[PDB]
């Protein structure tokens, strides 16, 4: 029979009335406000890409190595869902060593990049990983070596296998890089299918496993596209744990995530897209496995 999920009925009411902007601004109005004193210290000015996007002190990731422990990155710890994410800005030319130090120290297995290095004529992220196997990168400040092992290029995203080595202990780890290359700044994915096909690739890699440290997610500021990716993933995980779409309150989950980093989801259309992604993803969560193959085809990755 036909049965609308509660979220589908809410989506339709909002769409019909054209109230996405109002719904979104209300979330902005109710969002948490916490201090970012460390982010604002004079010595950290050059460690921040945007003066208006900073990590709260209570949830910021601290680098381990007495000199300066600051990186613009936040731990989004979703207690009910039991999954954590580190959301961070695209690293700067002087913070690529810090970025990989954070990946090492936090034991992350995957890095999710949702932007291109150049967008709208400006450099939104440093070229922080090696583009050629034979041109490995050594971060002198943090003593790490990063090598490109292989890459699988699809039409709108690429997955790279990287080797990160702590030169101090000579221990090495495989880091998976998931790079979404067709998601515009302040925009939305081409379709729920393209987005979900990508999120499922990250999921299938095992990078979100609780056995690993938190996946690192970023775009340029690390709040819009990054927020959309984590909101959709957490909502789908909550639905999955309970096998009940009705126990999922998307706006409530977003406000919970905003307790850990400011400005997650930057436009009303990103919020609308998040609903679309969760509604479509619910089909797979609730047992229609065949939809994953459908997304792969509609995504036109090949
Ligand atoms: Cl200072
Ligand atoms: Cl790029
Ligand atoms: Cl451009
Ligand atoms: Cl840069
Ligand atoms: Cl763009
Ligand atoms: Cl905001
Ligand atoms: Mg705390
Ligand atoms: Mg080696």
How many angstroms separate the alpha carbon of residue 230 from the centre of ligand 5?
A: 20
Burial class of 51 by CB neighbour count within 10 A (0 to 12, 13 to 18, 19+) = exposed
Q: CA-CA distances (angstroms) from residue 220 to 186, 225, 239?
A: 10, 9, 29
The count of domains in the chain is 1
Ligand 5 is an ion; residues with CB less than 5 A from it: 119, 184-185
Closest residue by Cα to residue 137 from 123, 122, 147: 147
Q: What is the signed CA dihedral for 38, 44, 45, 46, rounded to 10 degrees?
A: -150
**CA-wise closest residue to 48 among 215, 222, 185, 225:** 222
Q: How far apart (Å, rounded) are the C-alpha atoms in residues 83 and 205?
A: 15
Residue 232 · residue 125 · CB < 8 Å: no
Ligand 4 center to 91 CA (angstroms):
6
**DSSP characters for 79-130?**
TTTTEEEEEEPPPPTTTHHHHHHHHHHHT--EEEE-S-SEETTEE-S---S-
Phi, psi (deg, nearest 5) at residue 137: -110, 135
H/E element holding 298? helix 291-299
- Cα 294–295–297 angle (5° rounding)? 65
Q: How far is CA 254 from CA 47, 270, 289, in A?
A: 27, 12, 27
Phi first, then psi: give them for residue 189, nearest 5 degrees: -65, 165
DSSP letters for 264-284: -S-SHHHHHHHHHHHHHHHHH
Distance between CA atoms of 229 and 218, rounded to whole angstroms? 10
The domain spanning residue 61 has which CATH number?
Answer: 3.90.190.10
Q: Tell me, in angstroms, the distance from the centre of ligand 1 to residue 261's CA.
A: 22
Taking the CA of 124 as reference, the closest ligand is 4
For the chain, what is the total number of helices (H) and then of strands (E)? 8, 11
* Residues after which the chain is discontinuous, using a C–N cutoff of 2.5 Å: 65
Distances (CA, A) of 32 to 56, 65, 106, 192: 10, 30, 25, 28
Angle made by CA atoms 191, 154, 150, in degrees to the nearest 5: 140
Ligand 1 centre from 69 Cα, in Å?
12
Q: How far, in Å, CA of 69 to CA of 63, rounded? A: 4
Structural domain including 103 reads 1-302
Residues in the 5 Å CB sphere of ion ligand 6: 28, 263
99: left (phi over 0), alpha (psi -120 to 50) or beta: alpha
- Per the CB < 8 A criterion, the answer to whether 192 and 273 are in contact is yes
Experimentally, the structure was elucidated by X-ray
Residues 6+ apart with CB under 8 A from 45: none
90, 144, 184, 200, 206 from 203: Cα distances, Å: 22, 27, 22, 5, 6
**What is d(CA 180, CA 199) in angstroms, rounded to the nearest whole number?**
10
């Amino acid at each position: 029979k036909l049965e609308f999920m509660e979220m589908e009925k809410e989506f339709e009411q909002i769409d019909k009335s054209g109230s996405w902007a109002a719904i979104y601004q209300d979330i902005r109005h109710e969002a948490s406000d916490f201090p970012c004193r460390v982010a604002k210290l004079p010595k950290n000015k050059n460690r921040n890409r945007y003066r208006d996007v900073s990590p709260f002190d209570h949830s910021r990731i601290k680098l381990h190595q007495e000199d300066n422990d600051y990186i613009n990155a936040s731990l989004i710890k979703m207690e009910e869902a039991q999954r954590s994410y580190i959301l961070t800005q695209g690293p700067l030319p002087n913070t690529c060593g810090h970025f990989w130090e954070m990946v090492w120290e936090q034991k992350s297995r995957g890095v999710v990049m949702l932007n291109r290095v150049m967008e709208k004529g400006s450099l939104k992220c440093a070229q922080y990983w090696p583009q050629k196997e034979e041109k490995e990168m050594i971060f002198e400040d943090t003593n790490l070596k990063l090598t490109l092992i292989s890459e699988d290029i699809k039409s709108y995203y690429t997955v790279r296998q990287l080797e990160l080595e702590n030169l101090t202990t000579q221990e090495t780890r495989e880091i998976l890089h998931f790079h979404y290359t067709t998601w515009p700044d302040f925009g939305v994915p081409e379709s729920p299918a393209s987005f979900l096909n990508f999120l499922f690739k990250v999921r299938e890699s095992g990078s979100l496993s609780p056995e690993h440290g938190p996946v690192v997610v970023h775009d340029s500021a690390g709040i819009g596209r990054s927020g959309t990716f984590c909101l959709a993933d957490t909502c789908l995980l909550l639905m999955d744990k309970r096998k009940d779409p009705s126990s999922v309150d998307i706006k409530k989950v977003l406000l919970e995530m905003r307790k850990f980093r400011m400005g997650l989801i930057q436009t009303a259309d990103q919020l609308r897209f998040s609903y679309l992604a969760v509604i479509e993803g619910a089909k797979f969560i609730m047992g229609d496995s065949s939809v994953q193959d459908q997304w792969k085809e509609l995504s036109h990755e090949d």
